[PDB]
Design a protein around this nucleic acid. Structure first.
Lengths: 148, 50, 102, 63, 195
RNA sequence: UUAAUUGGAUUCAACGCCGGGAACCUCACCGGGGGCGACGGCAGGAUGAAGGCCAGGCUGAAGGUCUUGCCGGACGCGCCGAGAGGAGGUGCAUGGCCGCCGUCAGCUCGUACCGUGAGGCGUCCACUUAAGUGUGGUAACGAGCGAGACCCGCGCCCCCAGUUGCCAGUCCCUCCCGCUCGGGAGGAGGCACUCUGGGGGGACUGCCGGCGAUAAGCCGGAGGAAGGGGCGGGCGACGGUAGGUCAGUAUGCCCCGAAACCCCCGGGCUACACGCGCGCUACAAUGGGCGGGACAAUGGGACCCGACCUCGAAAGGGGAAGGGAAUCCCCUAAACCCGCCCUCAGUUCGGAUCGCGGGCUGCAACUCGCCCGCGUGAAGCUGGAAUCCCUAGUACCCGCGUGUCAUCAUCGCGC
């Protein structure tokens, strides 16, 4: 079983609650005061939003292999209203995801291929697919059809 | 003193090679022609209506 | 083993097919394995322009399109085969680029 | 806008007058015979001539 | 880039076309063609009077050979001059000829009719001559003389009919002439022959 | 109003039009300074320049000029002819181009016929067509342009060939996990589906029945992926509108010639009590905010696409792979739903409007760019007579990209 056999929402929730325990991942002192994206209008509501970002960003490294900062910014970007002018699609912040990637890289879960991106270490794959097969067990019990 | 200043940017930098107007110069892979002059040379360039 | 990658490009389809047939006949007459002519995505250059020469009149526009077509010929390396692609009679509009790949 | 054009109504009459036995009620058959007998390059006009000669051959035996 | 090179070579060839049309108004400039070889650019030109392009002692062509290698930045323009086989089958050539005729004090009805009869005599099929401008007064007028088959609409007309626009200068003004020539060799798509 | 808001254009058919590019340039507007004048005729000539050159001052500026003193060696200009140029002008003085009556359904020619003639039929009538589309009668018969035909792209199928595409099947090798069933991923190697594109077929009132003169053609039916102008266009003839375009090209005519020439710069083309048109948004609980995920596509990229490492919130900086096009990048689409929060309010809507501090570009943006974040929060809480347009991948509605292009468009384009 793998992340590909389980929903993204539940898997990111599991990775977030699990990684909340680890001490290497922590929101920086400027995280609670700076919104997750330029395009955002208000500040984040829940105080766990940092770990979710990590819980998502590593999942991205699980799927795309090599990842850099700008493509992450484009993905996390969104639609912001420009008043009298129309809504426009903008990129998100870069420093937050850069710090999350650095914390994960110190966590050993992700590594850097210079000139190609950030890829996922075998240990990171093991942890992610372990959570995914945990969830697949649970959802097999909830939904027997997932046995197939 | 009778020299025109050297400009790389702006309309004053770009001029149509055929007519000489300072207005509409389409630069799709380097044509340097005005937009209306483009019609008087359309079928010599290989272009075809569709 | 070595291969030569021959990219032919032209506007008129007939000239490109003519040169492809000449290359294929030469490759078969020289008895060289040739990967057949793969027709690559034609590039479509589309230009829109308002037909009004002045600021007066209904806004009418015209779109003109170039369809520039390209083909790929991957042949195996053979000097006797490579000596018979510089002698081919090439129509002017056809452009041929012959590179080598390990 | 069905109406078969004039020059089709003109071509078909001669075509079936010269080679009446050649054509039958089958549309594909008469279409291939139009293709081999005439020099049309437009598939559409070939098939239109085929349709009109199909109907014509059909009327040949009704009276 | 292929897209940055095809258009560049085309536009240079056509700038040469326009430049030579300007330079060869008296020579009945009929057509141009370019070939590229490592030796250089073989420039083929079809004109109605090659002797006029040659002029005297090849002086004129040599001078043209100068302009091309300086004005347009070409590598060895090798200019060869030839004659058009049937100048009455080319719209542009007869258009320029009629423009020159009207520039010579030749009456519009007479000259247009004479050119039409000549082109019909050369084996053409369809002739159209539209003359526009001040013709019989201060006001401007347009008159069209046509003879024979000429379907003006459709893709075939774009592909089989030769068009030519010329402008004739006179003290009263500039007179436009549009010449459309349909040769006999072409075939309209509605023409099916029995066997 | 201003020195300037340059000018062209007037209802349909101008009014996000020229403008598919006003910070200088665009410029054709206003102020200021500076310098051009082809060549003939006459004069000077060269006994030395016509061009620059300081020390300095009048110039926003420069041997521009000025006292100044030299060259560099050699023709400069004064007037009459008369230039080069002119976005200086006259678009009922033109060519072309565009607009609409209009892709409309019409317009023409030979002979014959009628009429003293201006001229009539053909081109008329019944049915029918998108179409002077075709058919039965007709003093007429033949024939041309137009529309049709034709050309482009689109969906169903198949051959040819693939450095597009993949736990399609996948021995062997690599990684991780598990319930040990298998799950997922790469290499090995293959060419499988779409795909890119060289061709052909299919699809055609083809048939059933009816209608219609049994004709044309129409209706309903079935079968077929698709059917009775397959779908959207290119292709709009004859004249008229004395429409607009000489402020682009060719150009009738007139006019200036140190100017009606050219060059440089400050401003203006953005100026407001205002009227009108068109696009963009704000007038919430569908809702605003946090997090997850199903997702394209037209095209483009060389001082560029710029992936990507790293720093800075950040606009971005240092380095940096690959890329001149199914090879790399732009790359994300957007719409949507849910785990959760907020609780019908001119407010947690909405950001205009100010001031602050940073980023990009360019000689420089206060007239005259935007963005990044901060206190701040306008009007607007569903709008009268009247009112324009679309009709099936279509209306509605939602976004991407790119042209022109450092920036400017809320625009046009096209996906």
């Amino acid at each position: 079983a793998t992340v590909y056999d389980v929903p993204g929402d539940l898997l990111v929730e599991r990775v977030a609650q699990r990684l909340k325990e680890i001490p290497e991942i922590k929101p920086p002192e400027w995280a609670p005061f700076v919104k997750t994206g330029r395009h955002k209008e208000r500040l984040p509501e829940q105080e766990d939003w940092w770990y979710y970002r990590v819980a998502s960003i590593l999942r991205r490294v699980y799927l795309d292999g090599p990842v850099g900062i700008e493509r992450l910014r484009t993905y996390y970007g969104g639609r912001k209203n420009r008043g009298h002018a129309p809504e426009k699609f903008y990129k998100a912040g870069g420093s937050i995801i850069r710090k999350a990637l650095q914390q994960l890289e110190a966590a050993g879960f992700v590594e850097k291929v210079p000139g190609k991106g950030r890829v996922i270490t075998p240990k990171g794959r093991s942890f992610l697919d372990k959570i995914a097969t945990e969830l697949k067990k649970e959802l097999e019990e909830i939904i027997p059809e997932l046995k197939k | 003193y009778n020299k025109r200043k050297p400009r790389k940017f702006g309309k004053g930098a770009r001029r149509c090679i055929r007519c000489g107007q300072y207005g509409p110069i389409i630069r799709i892979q380097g044509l340097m022609l005005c937009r209306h002059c483009f019609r008087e040379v359309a079928p010599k360039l290989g272009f075809r209506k569709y | 083993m070595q291969k030569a990658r021959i990219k032919i490009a032209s506007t008129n389809v007939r000239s490109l097919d003519e040169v492809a047939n000449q290359i294929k006949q030469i490759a078969e007459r020289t008895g060289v394995r040739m990967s057949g002519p793969i027709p690559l995505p034609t590039k479509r250059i589309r230009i829109t322009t308002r037909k009004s020469p002045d600021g007066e009149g209904s806004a009418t526009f015209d779109r003109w399109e170039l369809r520039v077509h390209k083909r790929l010929i991957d042949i195996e390396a053979d000097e006797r085969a490579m000596r018979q692609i510089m002698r081919i009679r090439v129509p002017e509009d056809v452009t041929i680029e012959i590179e080598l790949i390990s | 806008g069905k109406i078969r054009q004039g020059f089709i109504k003109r071509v078909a009459r001669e075509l079936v007058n010269k080679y009446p036995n050649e054509f039958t009620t089958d549309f594909e058959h008469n279409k291939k015979k139009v293709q081999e007998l005439t020099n049309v390059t437009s598939k559409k006009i070939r098939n239109r001539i085929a349709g009109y000669v199909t109907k014509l051959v059909r009327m040949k035996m009704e009276g | 880039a292929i897209e940055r090179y095809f258009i560049r070579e085309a536009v240079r060839e056509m700038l040469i076309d326009e430049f030579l049309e300007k330079e060869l108004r008296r020579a009945g400039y009929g057509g141009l063609d370019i070939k590229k070889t490592p030796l250089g650019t073989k420039v083929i030109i079809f004109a109605a009077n090659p002797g006029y392009v040659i002029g005297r002692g090849g002086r004129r062509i040599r001078e043209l050979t100068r302009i091309l290698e300086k004005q347009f930045g070409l590598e060895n323009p090798q200019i060869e001059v030839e004659e058009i086989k049937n100048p009455y089958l080319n719209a542009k050539v007869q258009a320029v000829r009629l423009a020159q005729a009207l520039e010579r004090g030749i009456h519009f009805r007479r000259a247009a009719y004479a050119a039409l009869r000549a082109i019909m005599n050369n084996g053409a099929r369809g002739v159209e001559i539209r003359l526009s401008g001040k013709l019989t007064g201060e006001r401007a007028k347009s008159i069209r003389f046509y003879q024979g088959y000429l379907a003006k609409v459709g893709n075939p007309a774009e592909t089989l009919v030769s068009k030519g626009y010329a402008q004739a200068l006179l003290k009263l003004g500039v007179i436009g002439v549009k010449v459309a020539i349909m040769p006999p060799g072409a075939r309209l798509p509605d023409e099916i022959e029995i066997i």
